[PDB]
Symmetry: D2
Subunit: 351 residues, 4 copies
């Protein structure tokens, strides 16, 4: 038998998977078909994100990431995950063609099932690196309870196996130029920022004791506290513990090296990767936020079939507490004028 489209794509499974509970309980509602197909498409795309994501995790875990041939493939697959999520954010607009009233006519046949029971959404959160600590109080206790057997087993492995956060952290820690014996990035930077701020305090104190200056002297003192707190490793470990940061002090230094020196040939694709990790975080959140806006129109204030407050619980998930790579965002707090960036000498350029 020569290969046929329908058989290749196992459409005898995919297109024989649509059972309107409304029809099964004798009262067919038209739009329930849309409800099912929308979720099934979301779930196809989750599996494909998981396929890309597990493949990039494997390239870090098995050391292939160490060979820089593999960086185009890493960035290309991670960018693919953001392109898919973009589509998933847009996909909400299809289900927004269902009125709250028409939803109401079949809602009742759904209890107590809910999106909460999405295994693959949880595999996706975990594998990226959402920690138990990060999860909203209701979310934390209640998320893994919905599961049993092999489904319970996959969820554990997703919590226990190396997350994309951990693997990126290890890789960032080996960023070339951090070696105190070599380029000594962190040392040179602390020196240049200290030198840099001293020049700034002198520029400001040289002005005629006015109120435009008084604005500058106190804006300086805030900027100085902040820039110098970069070098306070104990503040890092303290912020690590309140989970306001997630990355090792040294990964942070790696990420900042990649940012400042991103044009150097060996950092070009590494910079692209860091941008794609922020994009995935931004789009995961835009997904959460587009989900909230739609549930508001569908339920108003009413409790969800899963037994949550509904619209309010979901609103609490749209928070930086769920941004895994929140640190890559927060590095923008520590941007300095280009003039203060430790200059590169011919030795480390060729490197």
């Amino acid at each position: 038998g020569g290969l046929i489209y329908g058989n290749y794509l196992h459409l005898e499974k995919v297109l024989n998977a649509q059972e309107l509970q409304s029809e099964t309980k004798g009262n067919k509602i038209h739009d329930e078909h849309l409800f099912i197909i929308t979720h099934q498409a979301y779930e196809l795309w989750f599996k494909q994100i998981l396929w890309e994501l597990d493949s990039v995790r494997e390239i870090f875990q098995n050391g292939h990431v160490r060979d820089e041939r593999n960086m185009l493939k890493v960035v290309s697959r991670m960018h693919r995950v953001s392109v898919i999520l973009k589509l998933l954010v847009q996909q909400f607009s299809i289900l927004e063609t269902m009125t709250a009233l028409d939803f109401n006519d079949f809602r009742e046949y759904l209890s107590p099932a809910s999106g909460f029971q999405s295994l693959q959404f949880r595999l996706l959160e975990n594998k990226i690196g959402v920690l138990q600590n990060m999860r909203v109080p209701y979310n934390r206790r209640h998320y893994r309870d919905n599961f049993k057997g092999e489904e319970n087993e996959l969820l554990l492995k997703s919590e226990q196996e190396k997350t994309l956060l951990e693997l990126v952290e290890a890789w960032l820690e080996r960023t070339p130029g951090l070696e105190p014996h070599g380029f000594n990035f962190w040392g040179k930077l602390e020196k240049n920022i200290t030198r840099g701020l001293e020049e700034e305090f002198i520029r400001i104190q040289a002005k005629e004791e006015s109120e435009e200056k008084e604005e500058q002297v106190a804006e300086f003192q805030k900027q100085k506290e902040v820039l110098l707190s970069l070098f306070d490793e104990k503040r890092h470990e303290h912020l690590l513990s309140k989970g306001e940061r997630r990355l090792s002090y040294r990964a942070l230094q790696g990420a900042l090296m990649i940012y400042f020196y991103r044009e150097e040939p060996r950092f070009q694709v590494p910079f692209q990767l860091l941008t794609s990790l922020m994009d995935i975080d931004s789009l995961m959140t835009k997904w959460r936020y587009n989900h909230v806006c739609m549930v508001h129109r569908m339920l108003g204030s009413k409790a969800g079939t899963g037994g949550s407050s509904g619209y309010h619980y979901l609103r609490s998930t749209v928070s930086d507490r769920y941004k895994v790579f929140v640190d890559l965002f927060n590095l923008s707090t520590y941007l300095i004028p280009r003039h203060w960036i430790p200059k590169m000498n011919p030795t480390i350029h060729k490197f």
Copy 2:
């Protein structure tokens, strides 16, 4: 005990349908998984579009459309189809993150299967109203099918298309009755008069090569607007497949255009706009498919037999535009003052 998300959605089926031919032949190629999911996603949405479309056909076929209570349901479902198609056009962006080089690594394992074997794509084309005899020469499309599937295509070819059902509904548009509002006779009279006057204002002007441009413009207009009232011409053009709608449906469509602000016509106007939307997005679908296949194959021939790129280009024409007549009513728009007063 109680309904579980996974069970409701039959994810035991949906998420166990992903078999890489490259893996089955012991040379697993990563990007093959994307190829499969992308098509599985397209096919879920094709099934939803058929669901909405068949529901709208039945509302015309069983006379429920006669009861104007049901027009919000009709327009909202036809709008929903165009919203889904917007997503399917955007959806090519995902598959375009596969390089041609990466595609080249699993392409051999697909032979001789292809999109020509999409039952649902063909069912959708037929149910809207793509005729067997208007398909570009190389498409003979149904030979790619056998068995139960092949029967369904013929039910789809012989059962009443959206085009036929909208034609019948257009033929009953209120205002067309020669003893009533007599739209057609009044429109002919007002265009004939409006033109006569328009020509008087040209023979005022001082003979020049500017006045000759007006006379030349006027003669082109006159011929086009007056040809609207040539029924023998419409029947000739129907038979050549340059028009699809009966002469009387065309009159009903023009009535809906001119008088759209009249409450009874507001939603019917939204319906005609949606039908044109759906043709526009189908053709955007064919064009985005074409643009991607060019990057993937070049001028190489398809696994499904055809020349690939060049053949698919040919499917991006008004040959495949079911509601072409609704686009071409723009050709016969006239100044407001000429529209018969209500």
Copy 3:
């Protein structure tokens, strides 16, 4: 003969790009993108004001009472939605600028900011955002003729108010007519008989008829519509298929759409500002990021009532049966 460039006054549009970075002697390439992005946002804000004002004027001059105008109204409201969808997508362009590169010309913007966009505020005011519900005055940014326009835009009737009046005159609320409200209270009460969530579900439904609770929540600002407007809204939801209700229901749908898309614009702005500045202060004085997060809330959802009515949805067999008489009144 008319020429494209002159029709479009391109001599102004394409001579409006001045890089402040270039003016102070070190041109930064990416500033040109920052300028053009803001200019296109402002062109589109103007087009939304033009649509919105024309719909305001169609309620205020009485024409909305002529139902042949409903197509124009829902079509112009729909158009504002399509423009807002593009304005949300348009952040994707400015996100091709890295924080690093932004950082190179940001110094020259001090102290200008979005807070000084007149059109954004006119738009917020004209839809019906109340200044007493804003997270902190915004007018302190504005002076001269701009402070005037802005003042007019709070005092002149908002889209919410005009939509309110219109919802208040909705066919079927008349107590000695179809008496929608009385029959609904009869019908919710007659159905509420049958781990039971029923006790919670009965408590919330029946508080719909508590005209007093509404009065309190309204003055407080957690609700925005008159009690009677909210009756009209719910009338149009339940009887949306009735010929006369179809395009009015499309209008309510598109009003919620505009709230969603404003909030989506607010949230996309936030996501981009987060990558651009981090937890830095904004050039206009505020703790940029955390303040912009506060604008993404129901304080700023003008038509929150139309959203919240999903709470009070009932099975259809409870909805007051519509007799052959009022079926006749709601035909064309």
Copy 4:
């Protein structure tokens, strides 16, 4: 203090809206949408020219030789394709104007058209649309509709080095092409010759079947196309026919970057070639969405027949980059890299 409105010069941008219907005493509401839409497009064409000129410059002044500039080049080419995506999306706004409403102000616009957009022509020229290959309108050149300085600026844009010419030059210096070096081309012919021979043996070994009759017709087709690629004389011929645009040597660089894209020196260059095809594809979707809208607005009123001509490979400047997918070969035929050339493609 700098003020938002002054910074953006809004005193120009938001005082550039003159409805011609209104300045002839019959104001039509939708004419405003028409004007804003075009003005948004023109703002964005100006951004695309800003990006595209900086990139041409980077090539022209020899800075692109310094590979630390590749992140900037590929960022600005990707940005152009991101802008062009929104411009394609932008047509949906104008599609909310009905043909009936458009018809109320159409008369006031004569004889102006999109044909008169200076920036759209510069954009076409600077990317590298050849005037010799453009479909004529009314049997005449596209520069007829422009005079004075605008006519002069279009002429410069035809004569100055196009993005195509500057990519072509850089494609010609692709490392690995040196006959005395890695000798990519010679090695490729050798590996393709062997590949086809090895393939012809496994087929002639199969039983005389439907497959055997078929695979010999297909194999003989694939054979003609692949050996086609080494025919430098055919290529020079197709250059002049305009059916190909890049020099034979540039073609070689492009194919080298495809096959060895994972090589670090080749990662970002492959991303650039991917972006060039992206821009061609999005310019053509621009042309097609414009057409689909004009069909609805005008019908057969013949502009709509010229516009369907522009949706053609005449206007696809990097058509060669697409067509290379014709000459793709199994992974294992690609000439291997050794530690003398592998180490020359390490950053």
